[PDB]
Design an enzyme around this catalytic site. Structure first.
Site, PDB file in Angstrom:
ATOM      1  N   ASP A 134     -37.894  33.819  18.488  1.00  0.00           N
ATOM      2  CA  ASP A 134     -38.450  32.645  19.071  1.00  0.00           C
ATOM      3  C   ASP A 134     -37.884  31.428  18.341  1.00  0.00           C
ATOM      4  OD1 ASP A 134     -39.889  30.995  20.775  1.00  0.00           O
ATOM      5  OD2 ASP A 134     -41.785  31.988  20.546  1.00  0.00           O
ATOM      6  N   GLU A 140     -49.102  25.931  24.556  1.00  0.00           N
ATOM      7  CA  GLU A 140     -49.555  26.526  23.312  1.00  0.00           C
ATOM      8  C   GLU A 140     -50.610  25.683  22.643  1.00  0.00           C
ATOM      9  OE1 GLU A 140     -45.158  27.896  21.711  1.00  0.00           O
ATOM     10  OE2 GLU A 140     -45.817  26.252  20.418  1.00  0.00           O
TER      11      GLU A 140
HETATM   12  C1  LIG Z   1     -42.759  21.925  19.754  1.00  0.00           C
HETATM   13  O1  LIG Z   1     -41.394  22.272  19.965  1.00  0.00           O
HETATM   14  C2  LIG Z   1     -41.103  22.728  21.268  1.00  0.00           C
HETATM   15  O2  LIG Z   1     -41.546  24.079  21.411  1.00  0.00           O
HETATM   16  C3  LIG Z   1     -41.228  24.655  22.681  1.00  0.00           C
HETATM   17  C4  LIG Z   1     -41.939  26.008  22.751  1.00  0.00           C
HETATM   18  S1  LIG Z   1     -41.573  27.039  21.343  1.00  0.00           S
HETATM   19  C5  LIG Z   1     -40.771  28.479  22.029  1.00  0.00           C
HETATM   20  O3  LIG Z   1     -39.605  27.985  22.704  1.00  0.00           O
HETATM   21  C6  LIG Z   1     -38.865  29.031  23.392  1.00  0.00           C
HETATM   22  C7  LIG Z   1     -37.568  28.442  23.945  1.00  0.00           C
HETATM   23  O4  LIG Z   1     -37.832  27.244  24.721  1.00  0.00           O
HETATM   24  C8  LIG Z   1     -39.717  29.650  24.512  1.00  0.00           C
HETATM   25  O5  LIG Z   1     -39.007  30.668  25.235  1.00  0.00           O
HETATM   26  C9  LIG Z   1     -40.920  30.315  23.877  1.00  0.00           C
HETATM   27  O6  LIG Z   1     -41.761  30.944  24.877  1.00  0.00           O
HETATM   28  C10 LIG Z   1     -41.669  29.308  22.991  1.00  0.00           C
HETATM   29  O7  LIG Z   1     -42.633  30.068  22.282  1.00  0.00           O
HETATM   30  C11 LIG Z   1     -39.707  24.667  22.882  1.00  0.00           C
HETATM   31  O8  LIG Z   1     -39.316  25.130  24.182  1.00  0.00           O
HETATM   32  C12 LIG Z   1     -39.134  23.261  22.715  1.00  0.00           C
HETATM   33  O9  LIG Z   1     -37.714  23.360  22.709  1.00  0.00           O
HETATM   34  C13 LIG Z   1     -39.583  22.663  21.394  1.00  0.00           C
HETATM   35  O10 LIG Z   1     -39.132  21.303  21.288  1.00  0.00           O
END
Ligand SMILES: CO[C@@H]1O[C@H](CS[C@@H]2O[C@H](CO)[C@@H](O)[C@H](O)[C@H]2O)[C@@H](O)[C@H](O)[C@H]1O
Length: 606
Positions: free
Chosen positions: A289, A495
């Site tokens: 992740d 989240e």
């Molecule tokens: C707070 O920062 C932001 O977080 C999000 C979600 S964290 C993580 O990101 C992965 C790739 O986008 C997702 O596939 C996964 O389900 C999430 O748990 C992130 O997308 C932003 O890029 C980031 O700025």
């Protein structure tokens, strides 16, 4: 071997395993570590991609080339990056990933499908498969080859800010919804070995089962937290859909931020290598992740050297760094050079990454197909989304007493009707999180049809439709309305900002429903990612519909309200009486629901 400059890995007629072995045997350490490195488009340039032999890029939530970008702008962006990767010594194409989790949802004008909780309400796996097919087309319209979906979390507590990304609290429903995978990737061949990665070709995308494992079981539904449950509950609730994913050839698996009994998943060798790879025989690649390895330590990032060692030895193949690539590459290089991480581990990671890329046709079609641009927001996909939205609706109440005339379906012809509420004319609200922005947004953020616009598109031309967002009781009583449709509910979230202990909808919500229903017979449309405190809304309303987060096609809502189709959705989650009861799931010993899992009233088409 003919053309004298013959290179086996470049020959499209050769078996994947030979191409992989042929390429791997030619690679430097730097080229290998490069394949294992995924970076954000926000830090990528041609020189970075070339000089570091980068394996993958992503757009995280909201990471877009610009607001309102066309399909072609996305293609040009991806292609620019790909050109730089194809110019390396070995010309290994990059794979570009994005969260296309209810359609290609970062992209302006993409079809936005209902979120997973609503899809679980449909009990229609073939619908979800078709959503997968359409989503892959819209992702390929933008030149992207890899979707971070499906989320196969089994959400066990609706206080979790990602509960809407779970099809159900019942793992059997989640397992049935893994049909998303062969929609996104293509049906696997007849002879297929479970755990092998599969993508049919350039009109399909690599999928990603996430987040491994037990992301839906965190205590108090706290995102990223601790899933305290014995092996048996892990294996009986949170694991099974990963096995269905293996049988359907899922290409990748993303590891959870969460822990299982205090062991960080990103450092869990027993589960990642022992179970996922060596027991389920997963042969695709395992991806971290977003800064997942950073979070192995507390504070996060406080010993990045340990983060790299622990994650890579646990068995992760590709790291979603995604920003500090220099540090990641230097550190991993150091570990390999000092014998802390053996070459066999590096070669296993790269073998898996390359296997996915070769299998999916990436070396034969590394660049975008401009003819695919018009798949973005294509009307047939919107019609599918409209079908899905309609099928997702769960009718919770349709008459205040058993002898009342049923309010739904409503007549399309009436002298004057009222549409009201904060969610009646707000496309962002009806889409929720992961739409344009990571956390979603308010207002007209993409192309779609709000509930108000759907009503006006549906009614007889003699029907006068009045909109008032928050009318008072007097306005309603004086209006001469035949009935009202009032839409309220949750604001968009993800989240941690959706991690909510009280689960009550924001005001004015309830007060508008009370003012409207107090003056005229009303159908309340509740827009939410999850069950919320609903008794007061129920008490005021003649009818009430749980519409979840139905996406861009609000005509799905009116299709049911006006009787073109009957209500068929069924709760995919338990509806609690009180948050004090939580967690409370179907099959618990002390199960006292307001509405049990599977509940839903029906209606016939008129
Ligand atoms: C707070 O920062 C932001 O977080 C999000 C979600 S964290 C993580 O990101 C992965 C790739 O986008 C997702 O596939 C996964 O389900 C999430 O748990 C992130 O997308 C932003 O890029 C980031 O700025």
């Amino acid at each position: 071997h003919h053309a004298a400059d013959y290179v086996l890995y470049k020959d499209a007629t050769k078996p994947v395993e030979d191409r992989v072995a042929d390429l791997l045997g030619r690679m430097t350490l730097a080229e290998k570590i490069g394949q294992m490195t995924q970076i954000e488009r926000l830090v990528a340039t041609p020189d970075v991609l070339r000089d570091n032999f980068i394996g993958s890029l992503l757009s995280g939530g909201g990471s877009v080339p610009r607001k309102g970008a066309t399909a072609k702008e996305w293609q040009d962006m991806v292609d620019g990056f790909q050109k730089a990767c194809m110019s390396t010594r070995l010309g290994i194409p990059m794979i570009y990933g994005i969260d296309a989790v209810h359609g290609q949802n970062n992209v302006y004008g993409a079809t936005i499908f209902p979120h997973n909780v609503g899809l679980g309400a449909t009990r229609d796996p073939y619908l979800v498969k078709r959503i997968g097919e359409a989503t892959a087309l819209e992702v390929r319209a933008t030149g992207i080859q890899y979707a971070f979906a499906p989320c196969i979390a089994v959400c066990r507590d609706p206080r979790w800010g990602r509960c809407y990304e779970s099809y159900s609290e019942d793992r059997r429903i989640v397992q049935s919804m893994t049909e998303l995978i062969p929609g996104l990737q293509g049906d696997v061949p007849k002879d297929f070995t479970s755990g092998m990665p599969f993508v049919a070709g350039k009109n399909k995308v690599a999928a990603c089962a996430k987040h491994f494992v037990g992301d839906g079981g965190t205590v108090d539904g706290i995102n990223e937290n601790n899933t305290i449950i014995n092996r048996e509950g892990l294996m009986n609730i949170h694991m099974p859909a990963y096995k269905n994913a293996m049988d359907k050839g899922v290409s990748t698996v993303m590891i959870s931020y969460s822990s299982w009994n205090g062991v960080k998943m990103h450092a869990n060798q027993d589960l990642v290598t022992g179970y996922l790879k060596d027991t389920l025989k997963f042969k695709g690649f395992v991806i971290s992740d977003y800064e997942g390895i950073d979070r192995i330590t507390t504070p996060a990032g406080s010993d990045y050297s340990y983060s790299v060692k622990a994650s890579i030895l646990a068995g992760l193949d590709m790291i979603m760094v995604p920003n500090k690539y220099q540090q990641f590459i230097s550190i991993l290089t150091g570990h390999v050079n000092g014998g802390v991480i053996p070459m066999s581990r590096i070669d296993d990671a790269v073998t898996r990454i390359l296997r996915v890329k070769f299998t999916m046709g990436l070396f034969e079609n590394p660049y975008a197909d401009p003819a695919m641009a018009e798949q973005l927001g294509k009307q047939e996909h919107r019609d599918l989304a409209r079908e899905a939205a309609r099928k997702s609706l769960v009718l919770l109440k349709n008459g205040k007493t058993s002898t009342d005339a049923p309010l739904l379906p409503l007549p399309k012809k009436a002298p004057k009707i009222l549409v009201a509420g904060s969610h009646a004319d707000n496309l962002g609200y009806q889409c929720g999180g992961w739409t344009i922005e990571w956390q979603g947004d308010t207002g007209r953020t993409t192309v779609g049809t709000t509930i108000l616009e759907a009503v006006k598109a549906a009614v007889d031309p003699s029907t006068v439709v009045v909109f008032a967002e928050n009318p008072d009781a007097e306005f309603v009583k004086s209006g001469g309305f035949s009935y009202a449709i009032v839409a309220v509910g949750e604001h968009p979230y993800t989240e941690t900002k959706g991690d909510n202990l009280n689960l009550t909808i924001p005001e004015p919500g309830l007060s508008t429903v009370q003012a409207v229903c107090g003056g005229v017979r009303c159908a309340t449309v509740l827009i939410s990612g999850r069950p919320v405190v609903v008794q007061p809304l129920l008490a005021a309303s003649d009818a009430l519909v749980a519409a979840w987060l139905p996406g861009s096609e609000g005509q799905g809502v009116t299709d049911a309200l006006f009787g073109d189709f009957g209500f068929t959705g069924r709760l995919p989650r338990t509806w609690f009486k009180s948050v004090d009861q939580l967690p409370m799931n179907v099959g618990d010993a002390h199960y006292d629901p307001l509405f049990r899992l599977g509940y839903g009233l029906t209606t016939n088409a008129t």
